[PDB]
Write an enzyme that holds these catalytic residues in place. Sequence first.
Site, PDB file in Angstrom:
ATOM      1  N   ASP A 305      37.125  39.041  31.898  1.00  0.00           N
ATOM      2  CA  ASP A 305      35.872  38.933  32.048  1.00  0.00           C
ATOM      3  C   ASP A 305      35.119  39.894  31.177  1.00  0.00           C
ATOM      4  O   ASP A 305      33.784  39.331  31.037  1.00  0.00           O
ATOM      5  CB  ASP A 305      35.581  39.475  33.687  1.00  0.00           C
ATOM      6  CG  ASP A 305      36.163  38.425  34.725  1.00  0.00           C
ATOM      7  OD1 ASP A 305      36.059  37.415  34.478  1.00  0.00           O
ATOM      8  OD2 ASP A 305      36.640  39.070  35.866  1.00  0.00           O
ATOM      9  N   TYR A 391      32.864  36.215  41.496  1.00  0.00           N
ATOM     10  CA  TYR A 391      33.273  37.789  41.577  1.00  0.00           C
ATOM     11  C   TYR A 391      32.187  38.795  41.467  1.00  0.00           C
ATOM     12  O   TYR A 391      31.299  38.606  40.773  1.00  0.00           O
ATOM     13  CB  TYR A 391      34.266  38.144  40.362  1.00  0.00           C
ATOM     14  CG  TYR A 391      35.500  37.298  40.001  1.00  0.00           C
ATOM     15  CD1 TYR A 391      36.710  37.213  41.156  1.00  0.00           C
ATOM     16  CD2 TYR A 391      35.339  36.742  38.735  1.00  0.00           C
ATOM     17  CE1 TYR A 391      37.524  36.348  40.564  1.00  0.00           C
ATOM     18  CE2 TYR A 391      36.467  36.072  38.313  1.00  0.00           C
ATOM     19  CZ  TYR A 391      37.678  35.744  39.054  1.00  0.00           C
ATOM     20  OH  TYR A 391      38.662  35.043  38.648  1.00  0.00           O
TER      21      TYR A 391
END
Lengths: 658, 658
Positions: A305, A391
């Site tokens: 990420d 997320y």
Amino acid sequence: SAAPARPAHPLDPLSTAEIKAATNTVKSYFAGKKISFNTVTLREPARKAYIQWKEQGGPLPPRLAYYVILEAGKPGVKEGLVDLASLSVIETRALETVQPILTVEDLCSTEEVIRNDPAVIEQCVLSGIPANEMHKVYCDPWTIGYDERWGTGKRLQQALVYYRSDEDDSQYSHPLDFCPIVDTEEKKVIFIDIPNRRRKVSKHKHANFYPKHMIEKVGAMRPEAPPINVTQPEGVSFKMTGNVMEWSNFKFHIGFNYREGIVLSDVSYNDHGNVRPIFHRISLSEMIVPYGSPEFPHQRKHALDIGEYGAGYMTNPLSLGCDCKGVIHYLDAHFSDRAGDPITVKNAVCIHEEDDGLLFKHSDFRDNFATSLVTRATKLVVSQIFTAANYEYCLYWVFMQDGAIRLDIRLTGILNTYILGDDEEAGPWGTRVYPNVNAHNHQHLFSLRIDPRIDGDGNSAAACDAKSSPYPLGSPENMYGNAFYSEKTTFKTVKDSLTNYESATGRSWDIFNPNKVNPYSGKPPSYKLVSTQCPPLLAKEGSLVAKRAPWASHSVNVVPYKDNRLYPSGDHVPQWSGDGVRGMREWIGDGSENIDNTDILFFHTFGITHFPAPEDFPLMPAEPITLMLRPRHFFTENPGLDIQPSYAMTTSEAKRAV
Amino acid sequence: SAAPARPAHPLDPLSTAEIKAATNTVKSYFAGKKISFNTVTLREPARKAYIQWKEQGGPLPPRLAYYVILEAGKPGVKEGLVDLASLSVIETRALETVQPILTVEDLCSTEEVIRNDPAVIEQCVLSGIPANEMHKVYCDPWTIGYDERWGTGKRLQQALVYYRSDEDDSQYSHPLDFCPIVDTEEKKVIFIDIPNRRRKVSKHKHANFYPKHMIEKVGAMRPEAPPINVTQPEGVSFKMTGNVMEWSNFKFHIGFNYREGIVLSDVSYNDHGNVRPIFHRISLSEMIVPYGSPEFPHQRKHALDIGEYGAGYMTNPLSLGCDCKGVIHYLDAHFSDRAGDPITVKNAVCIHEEDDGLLFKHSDFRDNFATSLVTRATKLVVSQIFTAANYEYCLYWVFMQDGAIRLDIRLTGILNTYILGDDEEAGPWGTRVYPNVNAHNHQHLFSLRIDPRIDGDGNSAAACDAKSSPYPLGSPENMYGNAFYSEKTTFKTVKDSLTNYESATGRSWDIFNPNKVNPYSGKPPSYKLVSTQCPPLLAKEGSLVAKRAPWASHSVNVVPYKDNRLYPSGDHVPQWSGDGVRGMREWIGDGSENIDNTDILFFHTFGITHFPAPEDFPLMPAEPITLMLRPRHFFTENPGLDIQPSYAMTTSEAKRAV
Ligand SMILES: [Cu+2]
Ligand SMILES: [Cu+2]
């Protein structure tokens, strides 16, 4: 600016003026070429140069900007450095076989591409969405991560496709079965992964979570709870000077960039006039979120990420009084967009102080606890929240009045979901969290990068294992079998450092200065890493995941310092296969270099393994992760005892109350 | 007394009138004997009788008091039951070969004994304290714990001796070298352990921590910080009816006793009108704090704080306004003293609700996070703080709005210290935290006792281990080597349950109802124990520590339910050798009894291993310990979604705001 006003502090992020000066400088150097900006960020000074400037009256380090650009019709990227005081490009190179981080703009462009592509339209129709409902089709357009059919030869995204019945739906109950592959720079679909068994769009209701949805689903919202109000009528105790914080004897620089988000630098503690360094730099340097289904194409879900999207780029503008409760000081974040123009995320960092219960207490049983001292704790919190498609990662850097520093993380957001047939079993690789919804198993792993200076330069690290005495029960040395100690293994070479958390020994790690000694205990001053959320990497040796995240297969990796050793899966993460000597694999080398009493970098892998359950859907309750760095043998006594108690009564005072 | 008014609720602790009725009943039964009271407490109803009464319109369980008495000139104790409605003894027995918990009166009495004992005076003099300064000698009079020279034949304390230069000193910088052994009931010293190497009293200044001391030591206190004020101007959201709590859909009974402290019972969650049981009872049932120096007499330091002193007996009267901040509901605690009269500890338990950051959040990147929902979390906290001579244990039972339950503990107080010669090395068994002060290594271990009813009666337990697929990288089943799953091992017999935390698998444990199924996931409803502070017991097999605490050698122990299976090191803990079939050793038996789909008791061993450092001295900064029980497959979606968001904007609303 021409030249830009230079910042208050060498570690301040690039101002909007500096960003614009950097992009004008690069545009001019590449005049006559069609380029776009992927990254324009501070190139932090070398550690030596910084310390020399800060503590030794040394040279002012030059103010430099690191850029990454793409050029139409050219593969890969170009990167380099702009010297801001002379408005010139001083370093530059072409990297034709890498791909860079995906910016928000890049995430936002894919939907229009797939909605208008005839082959995608066709798969939508086979899946049960009419050709004229394409505005109801959405995608989370991840990096392709790595696909051996294309390598780094085109810049690619994989559009994980979903469907909304209405624009205010949460789309994650309605994934589609297929995966279009998109050339990010050409703006076209080049391929669609189509499963052998087709599954058509779910006919169930969307699983929604706004109040209007919940009123329909459960009848009514709960009434508003009576408020809990938090006030600081005489202001706060911390003081900021630009980005420099002072609070409870701590001093440090709060920085921020597109990739790591919050970067804490130049961290010291003021020990009754003696200002003692602790860390030169601490931040999160990379992540990996590897999924656990073996079926194609789900091996491509292992998002790094931080390297692939950026905790800065993805950071949320935090909301007046909702995300952060109480009296808050905010900072804004500044980046470049693709045209070279500065963009701002307002209120990207929140800074504030909060109650944290008791710091310490003791009372004497002899007068029924009349003799008593209690002192309350306050913590300082430096925080951001970033959103990587589905997320939400809430990051909190926490400073405490016993001299400890804690990183707390809360995971929330939405599960990544894939379609499940009516008769299809999700197990063993996922969970049916809603009808026709498979939420696959995955891990969230993080790489905490610590550049220490515990009480100064020249540091080492060690594993600390609790062990029973080797002498047996009944021996003169261990008559009653109760003896135990802490076995400290000092890491001499890089290879020695490559260690995992072990429950069998309650393993902690020390970062210490072997040149000093605590006058009481005889031991080196240290900060101790106390961290138990340290999952093994479940993906196998030699796997794509293990290869692309070499740092993740150990809890602790310690390497010699060198400049620009920030990102352990490399500088340009998307679409690297994991073959090659770069990042942590480069820094580890043959394992033989010295790391005892020198300048080191300590990289810690921590996180969770997530087996989804229905409680996580349609939106997931916050899941906590924490680690702490604690002073041990750093001070000669509790550092908080000069903090006024909340209540204090001595034995003599108690006798005088009769 | 008497017949006392019955309580509001069968699980309410004995009132002061009931305690008095009980002791008058027992004094009368033993008329003409000289007796004193060690314990007078509620004998809780059998689980079956309670559940039947609560949920099946069953018989009202009789109100009973369990008592323990000593009689002058008789060894050991007598114990029995009083039926309060008839003011009679209904069960009685003599236990001549056990010793009972030490009460605050028992602690307090020892100092007068050793100060007036000619042999103790003599040792003080040899130690450098003149015979006329005995008012400056103090002791922490622990249970002897176990000494093979006396067994249980006398009731014995070991006086850990210290010196104070002024009554307001913290004595722990000045331990003495010798250990008097005292007969608690005869009030006399029967022996003194004297070391081969003598170490006279330290000549250094005491290591003190009150403000007048710190001003001398560091020049000045820090100024008072600006305040952080917390108010609830419209009251609190929870509701108490006697000891029964309701808050955010949870309902439970808050109980309290001399030994366990807080006991939470009859815990249920209201799932939109379906009131679902979760636990019948949960508490801390025992502890052990084994020290790691093998030198005589330090083997006798391994305090079972709960069984030997009591978390109720030793509980602090709290603030008000200092220990617990904000708007607090307090409960008082009641016990019997040695004469049979009720005693009260006021504000023993504090109950309140606090902000707990974010419950959940999600925003859409598509409109730069304008589409967003954020909901803040509130937690409910039920706490006490107890002091066992030098230690303070702060216990926080926390209920959360995602349906999880947490236990949080903070350890503070003062290190137990022993004397260190000028040229003596403390390691490897302890640390020199101040000149002439050795703080020995120790562990703090705790036994959480869970009596579950997950969605009803008939439960099981399991270990859940994360595992890579057994199929190798490159296989058709695991082509990219990323597949992983949760291996669930259901315990069939007691022996199967005897398991430790394993970092290699990120082990968690499920307590589940195998008679039900989640309609989405297909799995049984469960509460999962997420707990990583799970030290191995470092003392060897067959050691005195391992024998007296059979529960401590596994992280998890699951046994069949039977009535009166509360205390896993047995009913009367002091001076038991650890030989015999009682407590956990009895409940485990031969390991073969069924624990699948039945009524079970799940005992969890958790805690820390403490290697002291000078940061811990003279008073120690709070050290945190936590564990959580989380609903997994219990609900069919996130249970907190009907709570009003702090902020919510849908995609359509964002577009209409221009
Ligand atoms: Cu997850
Ligand atoms: Cu301790």
